[PDB]
């Protein structure tokens, strides 16, 4: 490809700054708009004690040994189901 | 600066061949003996 | 006196403190995983930080302050950094191999499908896409920073570098939040395993990369770099592009194709 | 009826040393068919072939585990 | 089984193991020829007072020692691959038997018609009947019909194991969560031994395999009575 | 001054010396372990206990011989000592990082010893395959200490690889092209490239085993959708390159030794030797699955791996015939080093040939996991790698120390070792063909004769190892200082005397471009 | 900020025979002693831990 | 029995404007079921649901062409 713009006479600092503020940051601003829009807590699915999930072959070296490192009560059920 | 030349570019001394024999004996002997004593250790635990 | 251009380094204690800190960290991880204690690990992490700090400090002293980095020495450092990055690529390759192995032939325990039954993947068009625009954008700003430095523009170099760092931090915060929000965990079978270990090691590299860029920012503030000699910045930029490319592969493989 | 089965015959879909999927597939097929017949008012005897094949190929512990899970509601496969 | 002071392979019990014996004889001759040729040349280079120490040209003799080995490798690969594909041939078995590896014994399952299954443990040395082989006998043998194509499925319920019977040219790893297939076909009746071939812990050396090959008729009666 | 010199070193010679010392010590540990193995198999029955203590011994023997003896000696020892001298460099590119590659080894070794001290040790085989190596079949810290040992040894080698490649590419005289560097330097660079590419995959794999054991991941656990075979692929992807990493520096030293004692100014077909090592290095990355011929792979995959594996015989053959062609027309000096090199050529060839037998997946069905494999690798390792190390050691000892060994005693040492290793491993071919499995603490009665003879051979080797320690002592005890060495015009490493001064090449060599 | 690299160059090139890791002054000494103490002390402690883990506590 | 069909209900597998595969899938399903039942000695009435769905969704000319092709032996789908 070749994009859809032009310059190339000499790619320098001014050109890269132009790309930073004219293309890169605007893209980040759009994706930030999109993300902080499609967010919203999606309703957690019913719990099913699947044997291939919530694996426990050895307790974790922290807490009560049954909670994952970044455990989220709202969406991460324990092997026995969601928490209170 | 450091000492240079035969017998001076090493971490052990070769000034006395008997003291050297003692060094080498402990050095190589400890290595060879270690597995036997670890085996003994494992047998004496259960 | 020497009549070659290479660097004869002063006897240093850091290789030893670094090696011992490695023993303390591994010993420490063992103590933590099996004898419920973090004491060894804490000491190990501390001496490791101290070793790296002093070792790299000395490299700056030897180069910026003592002038030991002749063109030959700098050429060697270039090869060294490229080789290091190559080994990092191969490390990630092992994780990608594990991902594709598991996902291309889903076993019966998963329901014989991918993603496994019970797994609800994140939407690749949401935060994961944002993360992608964040890293690609930082690739552009670090290039502006590079050109500014070469053109002798101090203000704009600092400005561009600051933007690059902010973007790296933004990615890290976004990823941290995603980790907390994810409905699946590292214990959720091979899907959680591959997902967290691969993106986790990648996140670690982003933190290392940002730290490297921060070091460059402060060395720049202190006028260490000349418009022609600034290998530290070049290495940080190559490492940063590497981190960027690994993300693109993770994005396409795990977040998109693997969903 | 069209049977007289000795053992599960060669299946071109699973021609290699790894036969894990062959067992799995037939187990799924039988239980899918058994569910369709028990539902729409028909006879499970049509599902016979799959039953014989999976019985022949699948380790007893696998079938036993899968059966326990279908009852528990944790069977990961689609039936 | 292996006998005292054995040098080569156990006598072939299946047509495929016979095939391997001839392929090995073919390969071993090449191994002997090349290794003795190298030993000879070493001695030839070292037994003369004549010298030639100036620069010697190599782009001529290297053609010889590149093309020759290439030809030899093809002469080994041809029969090797013919046999490889032969072992993969579709044969359509008359019986399917499964074996699950465990720490440390094998269990067998004949579930084509009836739900027959049993464990197979090594007979402790202290318990051997006179004339029985130490470390090789088991309480329950794998009764199988001779001169018949049998499909063996191998897996494990714990760690890795490997199901082997040298006289039949068999070795199939027993991997948990995986069902490996191999085919068995004995040209003769008898007892055929093998041993676990993947390190599995404490008693890896003590979980043998014993096949009992008998005519179909006896196989059937045995089947029934083992209900 | 002692601490600054030996603990804070930034000198390639001193660092090479540390490596040689460490490797010599490790060799004693590895020898002891091999004696325990053969003592257990010396007569029918059980000597030490069941397969657990036995396999903890077998596993440690392998790790020690490979990671703590062979690699440190060849790469860290001879590599550090000779590479800079052979290209006229003042030192390594990263002299300080070089010191860390060394210092990571003692901690790495301590973790290996710790793993055998705690619990019941790691009796998993050096391949550490799960689930046996998992947290249920090997619960406790042992396997975790083993993984950590490998991590440290891994980092040591990766940093060492970066240092060697950089030094070799960047620090030769301006006029010297890569095609003007000695074959040993070529062997080290290629070895460094293999290490750089292979170790990171191993690291990935053992890290996944670590998480499966401690963080509840399931990369190799079918219950979570994992696969034990995935580990095998990851391990062997590193594992095969690893065996070539163990022999390449050996090939390099053999080229130097054969050339030197043939009274030749150069090895026959230099460019063919470079081509051969590069080809071997390349091919070594696409053949790993030949260690998995019985796991249940598709037949086409097996036909490919059989074929790809046999191709390596071609470049390896060029090296063997080139060594013979270097001897051709030479004024042969029957020194002890030459003897080790001649034994290497023959014994390595035998080991390589049985490797070709094993490449055939058809035959490997029956030979896999039997003593035929053990025979194969001990001919290439215990005879190949070890003879190259012994040859290089007796050849360069005068250079490193400034003293000469007693040649007659060195020739006696060679004779004893030659008998020992052959008596130990030759009978193992029979045991393999006849079906004796690997990793067994006891065997059926029929295997008694060959196991008895093999164990006696191992005692002969022990006698050789003890004699070697005495021989080194005698050299340092008598102090016969080196005066002159022949052929310095084509062996630059000797040109600064014995031992060379701490700092060499402060004023670089002069080399015209013409 | 102002460019003080020249000052730092003077300090680190001062012919006082000090190795680069201690040439900055007294603080280098302290940091070094802290680092080395934690390393060696921590190593002794790890050896002690190995000794403890080597034996069963039934 | 379990019917009382008005028209083919929403199918989560085909939630988009392009409904081509919905028709095709149900056509295949019916003929596969019909073949299984007529074979193993059972009743085609179990296949009814698929017949109603494909008849509702599929253009007459498509069904007609597919039928002609199954008869001719040129039907590209697997039945
Ligand atoms: C130590 C125990 C010895 C027991 C001996 C046999 C007893 C037989 C009884 C009675 C003998 C007759 C009745 C039984 C016949 C069985 C035939 C069979 O089933 O056949 C297959 C069998 C038996 O094969 C044989 O047919 C035996 C072959 C023996 C070759 C020996 C070379 C020995 C050299 C020096 C002595 C050994 C140590 C050093 C070996 C150094 C490396 C070769 O199994 C093998 O394949 C074993 C070998 C594996 C491959 C090694 C390949 C490279 C080897 C040597 C190259 C040397 C070249 C220069 C020439 C040789 C130069 C030195
Ligand atoms: C370099 C690698 C190496 C070396 C040299 C050896 C050497 C020996 N090994 Fe081996 N061995 C392995 C690597 C090696 N081994 C591996 C990888 C395995 C497989 C492990 C597994 O299955 O998991 C194994 C397995 C193994 C087994 C099979 C165990 C089983 O399956 O149950 C046996 C059995 O006899 C054995 C015996 C021996 C013996 C008697 C020696 C003797 O020849 C040793 C004689 C002594 C020496 C040759 C050392 C001399 C070197 C020095 C002391 C350095 C000197 C110093 C200077 C010159 C500076 N080894
Ligand atoms: C120094 C180490 C070293 C080296 C260099 C090699 C070299 C080779 N190895 Fe070996 N190998 C090991 C160490 C080594 N190996 C180890 C440690 C194991 C076991 C690991 C474990 O399970 O623990 C092993 C296992 C092993 C296996 C797995 C067997 C099994 O587990 O069932 C196979 C399979 O193909 C194999 C093949 C080869 C081949 C073909 C070569 C080739 O590179 C050899 C090429 C050389 C020659 C062929 C000789 C010289 C050539 C000529 C004179 C030219 C003419 C020749 C012909 C025309 C054939 N090796
Ligand atoms: C914010 C994004 C950046 C990621 C990293 C940041 C913080 C974590 C701490 C260290 C991570 C460094 C490397 C990754 C190692 C393991 C994967 C961790 C990735 C991660 O952080 O994964 C988390 C698991 O944490 C866990 O177990 C982690 C448990 C923490 C203990 C670390 C275990 C240490 C093992 C290290 C092995 C080192 C070997 C490396 C060798 C290198 C080469 C020799 C996921 O959380 P979860 O609750 O399961 O799911 C979320 C549900 N809401
Ligand atoms: C599905 C898998 C998923 C995982 C994938 C994850 C990530 C993707 C991969 C990569 C992307 C990451 C980062 C890329 C960004 C920057 C890298 C830096 C390159 C750079 O900027 O290089 C420059 C020039 O090129 C040079 O080095 C050229 C010189 C190079 C020297 C080093 C190489 C030596 C090593 C061995 C040699 C190989 C030999 C080849 C022949 C072998 C035949 C078989 C710097 O100059 P220098 O060193 O002085 O050389 C002087 C030559 N001009
Ligand atoms: C699967 C196994 C494969 C088996 C291996 C087969 C081995 C090959 C066998 C024979 C090779 C024949 C090569 C013929 C070369 C002639 C030798 C010669 O005589 O050597 C020189 C030629 O230079 C030159 O090629 C340079 C010198 C000789 C070059 C070749 C010598 C090396 C041969 C190999 C050495 C033995 C190793 C064999 C490996 C198995 C002599 O030079 P000139 O006479 O011009 O000058 C002398 C001055 N005059 C003119 C007054 C006489
Ligand atoms: C690369 C350029 C050279 C080109 C040569 C080709 C070599 C490798 C590339 C091909 C990889 C894709 C092939 C996948 C298609 C098959 C799908 C599949 O299914 O393959 C799967 C594994 O593939 C997998 O992970 C494959 C995982 C990858 C393994 C390859 C290892 C090489 C990686 C190292 C190279 C470093 C590169 C640096 C990166 C820039 C599973 O195996 P099956 O046996 O089917 O098991 C199923 C059984 O139930 C039935 O028998
Ligand atoms: C919470 C955070 C903690 C996490 C742990 C890791 C933390 C930080 C790692 C960040 C790396 C910082 C590196 C700083 C290096 C500063 C020294 C430097 O950059 O030194 C430069 C040389 O490059 C050099 O050595 C280049 C040096 C290369 C270093 C790059 C290595 C990265 C380290 C990765 C380690 C982990 C591996 C992955 C784990 C699985 C000096 O030369 P110049 O710049 O030309 O200056 C000279 C001019 O002034 C002349 O006029
Ligand atoms: C279970 C947990 C396991 C943990 C294991 C941890 C192992 C060690 C931890 C402590 C090590 C950190 C201390 C800092 C190391 C910096 C080395 C460095 O920066 O080395 C540089 C060379 O490598 C270069 O450039 C380029 C190369 C930069 C390498 C940076 C070092 C990072 C070490 C980790 C490597 C991991 C391997 C990655 C693949 C998986 C500088 O070379 P020197 O010889 O110093 O000087 C030469 C002078 O001319 C400079 O003026
Ligand atoms: C290759 C580079 C990788 C090197 C290794 C990475 C090292 C990772 C260190 C993780 O350490 C931690 O350990 C803990 C476990 O002890 C935590 O505390 C916790 O654990 C507890 C102890 O039981 C609880 O009391 C608390 O709730 C708390 O979450 C914790 O925050 C965290 O810092
Ligand atoms: C002080 C310095 C000017 C050059 C000098 O030091 O003489 C200025 C120029 C550009 C730098 C700034 C850049 O414009 C980028 C940043 C923008 C601000 O929003 C916060 C501080 C910020 C991080 C920088 C701080 C500022 O103090 C810098 C460092
Ligand atoms: C072209 C290259 C270098 C020559 C030089 O510049 O000196 C040489 C070195 C080694 C040679 C190779 C080796 O001699 C091995 C092979 C020998 C056959 O005679 C031809 C192909 C063959 C594969 C050679 C091709 C080519 O002539 C190579 C690759
Ligand atoms: C072994 C590895 C798969 C590892 C894994 O399961 O994770 C696979 C991936 C791709 C495979 C290769 C590619 O599919 C291409 C080739 C296909 C041929 O049928 C055999 C060789 C062939 C070269 C393959 C060999 C082997 O099966 C490879 C290398
Ligand atoms: Cu079971 Cu070894
Ligand atoms: Cu290999
Ligand atoms: Mg095996
Ligand atoms: Na024994």
PDB file of C-alpha atoms and ligand atoms in Angstrom, chain E residues 7-9 24 28 31-32 35-36 39, chain F residues 346-347 350 354 372 379 422 426-427 429-430 433 450 453, ligand 1:
ATOM      1  CA  UNK E   7      22.875 -59.396  20.629  1.00  0.00           C
ATOM      2  CA  UNK E   8      20.061 -58.358  18.278  1.00  0.00           C
ATOM      3  CA  UNK E   9      16.297 -58.089  18.054  1.00  0.00           C
ATOM      4  CA  UNK E  24      17.851 -53.227  10.198  1.00  0.00           C
ATOM      5  CA  UNK E  28      23.558 -52.127   9.942  1.00  0.00           C
ATOM      6  CA  UNK E  31      26.853 -48.632   9.462  1.00  0.00           C
ATOM      7  CA  UNK E  32      29.590 -51.302   9.621  1.00  0.00           C
ATOM      8  CA  UNK E  35      32.532 -46.956  10.334  1.00  0.00           C
ATOM      9  CA  UNK E  36      35.203 -49.500   9.341  1.00  0.00           C
ATOM     10  CA  UNK E  39      38.748 -46.441  10.869  1.00  0.00           C
TER      11      UNK E  39
ATOM     12  CA  UNK F 346      36.135 -42.592  14.899  1.00  0.00           C
ATOM     13  CA  UNK F 347      33.886 -42.736  17.970  1.00  0.00           C
ATOM     14  CA  UNK F 350      29.940 -44.531  15.161  1.00  0.00           C
ATOM     15  CA  UNK F 354      23.545 -45.077  15.099  1.00  0.00           C
ATOM     16  CA  UNK F 372      19.992 -48.235  21.920  1.00  0.00           C
ATOM     17  CA  UNK F 379      29.113 -42.250  21.842  1.00  0.00           C
ATOM     18  CA  UNK F 422      33.873 -48.375  25.090  1.00  0.00           C
ATOM     19  CA  UNK F 426      29.270 -50.677  23.435  1.00  0.00           C
ATOM     20  CA  UNK F 427      27.261 -53.450  25.194  1.00  0.00           C
ATOM     21  CA  UNK F 429      23.630 -51.455  21.824  1.00  0.00           C
ATOM     22  CA  UNK F 430      22.785 -55.130  22.513  1.00  0.00           C
ATOM     23  CA  UNK F 433      18.162 -54.064  20.311  1.00  0.00           C
ATOM     24  CA  UNK F 450      25.631 -56.774  29.315  1.00  0.00           C
ATOM     25  CA  UNK F 453      30.020 -55.563  31.750  1.00  0.00           C
TER      26      UNK F 453
HETATM   27  C1  LIG I   1      32.398 -55.569  24.973  1.00  0.00           C
HETATM   28  C2  LIG I   1      31.433 -56.744  24.645  1.00  0.00           C
HETATM   29  C3  LIG I   1      31.653 -57.480  23.291  1.00  0.00           C
HETATM   30  C4  LIG I   1      30.723 -58.668  22.901  1.00  0.00           C
HETATM   31  C5  LIG I   1      31.090 -59.174  21.498  1.00  0.00           C
HETATM   32  C6  LIG I   1      30.256 -60.250  20.738  1.00  0.00           C
HETATM   33  C7  LIG I   1      30.058 -61.699  21.272  1.00  0.00           C
HETATM   34  C8  LIG I   1      29.400 -62.591  20.172  1.00  0.00           C
HETATM   35  C9  LIG I   1      29.058 -64.084  20.479  1.00  0.00           C
HETATM   36  C10 LIG I   1      28.394 -64.935  19.338  1.00  0.00           C
HETATM   37  C11 LIG I   1      28.129 -64.288  17.944  1.00  0.00           C
HETATM   38  C12 LIG I   1      27.338 -65.117  16.880  1.00  0.00           C
HETATM   39  C13 LIG I   1      25.841 -65.493  17.137  1.00  0.00           C
HETATM   40  C14 LIG I   1      24.805 -64.346  17.228  1.00  0.00           C
HETATM   41  C15 LIG I   1      24.594 -63.514  15.953  1.00  0.00           C
HETATM   42  C16 LIG I   1      23.544 -62.399  16.162  1.00  0.00           C
HETATM   43  C17 LIG I   1      23.292 -61.524  14.918  1.00  0.00           C
HETATM   44  C18 LIG I   1      22.335 -60.375  15.214  1.00  0.00           C
HETATM   45  O1  LIG I   1      21.217 -60.474  15.663  1.00  0.00           O
HETATM   46  O2  LIG I   1      22.879 -59.294  14.680  1.00  0.00           O
HETATM   47  C19 LIG I   1      22.801 -57.953  15.228  1.00  0.00           C
HETATM   48  C20 LIG I   1      23.597 -57.777  16.559  1.00  0.00           C
HETATM   49  C21 LIG I   1      25.019 -58.305  16.612  1.00  0.00           C
HETATM   50  O3  LIG I   1      25.907 -57.686  15.693  1.00  0.00           O
HETATM   51  C22 LIG I   1      26.901 -58.569  15.641  1.00  0.00           C
HETATM   52  O4  LIG I   1      26.918 -59.545  14.906  1.00  0.00           O
HETATM   53  C23 LIG I   1      27.983 -58.223  16.688  1.00  0.00           C
HETATM   54  C24 LIG I   1      28.836 -57.138  16.043  1.00  0.00           C
HETATM   55  C25 LIG I   1      29.983 -56.670  16.892  1.00  0.00           C
HETATM   56  C26 LIG I   1      30.835 -55.596  16.222  1.00  0.00           C
HETATM   57  C27 LIG I   1      31.920 -55.332  17.227  1.00  0.00           C
HETATM   58  C28 LIG I   1      33.013 -54.326  16.963  1.00  0.00           C
HETATM   59  C29 LIG I   1      33.836 -54.400  18.249  1.00  0.00           C
HETATM   60  C30 LIG I   1      35.127 -53.578  18.323  1.00  0.00           C
HETATM   61  C31 LIG I   1      35.955 -53.760  19.621  1.00  0.00           C
HETATM   62  C32 LIG I   1      35.329 -54.586  20.783  1.00  0.00           C
HETATM   63  C33 LIG I   1      34.106 -53.964  21.482  1.00  0.00           C
HETATM   64  C34 LIG I   1      34.374 -52.652  22.235  1.00  0.00           C
HETATM   65  C35 LIG I   1      34.877 -51.411  21.433  1.00  0.00           C
HETATM   66  C36 LIG I   1      33.941 -50.875  20.345  1.00  0.00           C
HETATM   67  C37 LIG I   1      34.427 -49.611  19.650  1.00  0.00           C
HETATM   68  C38 LIG I   1      33.369 -49.125  18.689  1.00  0.00           C
HETATM   69  C39 LIG I   1      33.081 -50.143  17.625  1.00  0.00           C
HETATM   70  O5  LIG I   1      23.582 -56.436  17.153  1.00  0.00           O
HETATM   71  C40 LIG I   1      24.254 -55.282  16.708  1.00  0.00           C
HETATM   72  O6  LIG I   1      24.032 -54.660  15.681  1.00  0.00           O
HETATM   73  C41 LIG I   1      25.182 -54.746  17.788  1.00  0.00           C
HETATM   74  C42 LIG I   1      25.966 -53.530  17.257  1.00  0.00           C
HETATM   75  C43 LIG I   1      25.202 -52.220  17.128  1.00  0.00           C
HETATM   76  C44 LIG I   1      25.870 -51.223  16.174  1.00  0.00           C
HETATM   77  C45 LIG I   1      27.268 -50.669  16.399  1.00  0.00           C
HETATM   78  C46 LIG I   1      27.706 -50.105  15.041  1.00  0.00           C
HETATM   79  C47 LIG I   1      29.168 -49.679  14.840  1.00  0.00           C
HETATM   80  C48 LIG I   1      29.985 -50.787  15.482  1.00  0.00           C
HETATM   81  C49 LIG I   1      31.435 -51.090  15.184  1.00  0.00           C
HETATM   82  C50 LIG I   1      32.159 -50.508  13.998  1.00  0.00           C
HETATM   83  C51 LIG I   1      33.584 -51.031  14.101  1.00  0.00           C
HETATM   84  C52 LIG I   1      34.355 -50.927  12.803  1.00  0.00           C
HETATM   85  C53 LIG I   1      35.846 -51.295  12.845  1.00  0.00           C
HETATM   86  C54 LIG I   1      36.314 -52.605  13.521  1.00  0.00           C
HETATM   87  C55 LIG I   1      36.392 -52.622  15.085  1.00  0.00           C
HETATM   88  C56 LIG I   1      37.458 -51.658  15.705  1.00  0.00           C
HETATM   89  C57 LIG I   1      37.686 -51.533  17.236  1.00  0.00           C
END
